[PDB]
């Protein structure tokens, strides 16, 4: 089985956490919480709908980080009238990826700002 | 000199437009408006700053963003084609709205900050030519 403190699915273990952290420090903490630890990862429908019903039965209704991180900054960002990139006023620098516990859709949020989390490792 | 209707600034003409329409739909209609038309292009702080000072100024009691001319060229949900576990992403369930690659100013940022939201809001926009 999996840590006492974990929950398993096929061959992986789970483990939702209430303190909230920004994405970095959150991957970097499940890195700590067992070898090959990170942030959850969904391959599946099947995986995303065990987590969050872990996540929900655990803490409830709230929003936990998954482990995708700055997903528009490797976009191809260009300007409609042909312009080159040069000058930038983004509001945020970064987004990462999170549910929240009511459901497996995928949403965004700053990765500066805190959220729960849940951590995996494959056992 | 430019058009009855449009602001001037650094030799270029704008418009404000407070019609409501997605990204795709604004960008052809300035197309149409001028030509040589199309969605602002914000290239400098001055010319930030004279935008954030138009829309303030024209565009009121929207309640929106405001569109400019930049964003992801394609329509993939994301570009980051890796969890941090080091797996590809082969499987992705976004809720369209959250997968934000286009760019708007807010009134709360005065206009003058972009904010990544969905290319499929409706929101009003300024034109350039
Ligand atoms: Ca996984
Ligand atoms: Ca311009």
């Given at each position: 089985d999996c840590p006492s403190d974990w929950s398993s699915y096929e061959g992986h273990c789970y483990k939702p956490f209430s303190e909230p952290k920004n994405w970095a420090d959150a991957e970097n903490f499940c890195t700590q919480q067992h070898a090959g630890g990170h942030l959850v990862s969904f391959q599946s429908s099947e995986e995303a709908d065990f987590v969050v019903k872990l996540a929900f039965q655990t803490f409830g209704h709230s929003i936990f980080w998954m482990g995708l991180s700055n997903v528009w900054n490797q976009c191809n960002w260009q300007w409609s009238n042909a312009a080159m990139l040069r000058y930038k006023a983004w509001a945020e620098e970064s987004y990462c990826v999170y549910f929240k516990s009511t459901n497996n859709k995928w949403r965004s949020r700053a990765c500066r700002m805190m959220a729960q989390f849940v951590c995996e490792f494959q056992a | 000199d430019c058009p009855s209707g449009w602001s001037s600034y650094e030799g270029h003409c704008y418009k404000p437009f407070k019609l409501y329409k997605t990204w795709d739909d604004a960008e052809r209609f300035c197309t149409e408006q001028?030509?040589?038309?199309?969605?602002?292009?914000?290239?400098?702080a001055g010319e930030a700053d004279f935008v954030a000072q138009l829309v303030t100024e024209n565009?009121?009691?929207?309640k929106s963003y405001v569109w400019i001319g930049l964003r992801v060229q394609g329509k993939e949900k994301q570009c980051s084609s890796e969890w941090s576990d080091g797996s590809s992403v082969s499987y992705e369930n976004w809720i369209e709205a959250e997968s934000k690659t286009c760019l708007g100013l807010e009134k709360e940022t005065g206009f003058r900050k972009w904010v990544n939201i969905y290319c499929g809001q409706q929101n009003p926009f300024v034109c350039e030519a």
């Open positions: - | 001028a030509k040589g038309g199309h969605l602002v292009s914000i290239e400098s565009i009121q009691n929207t």
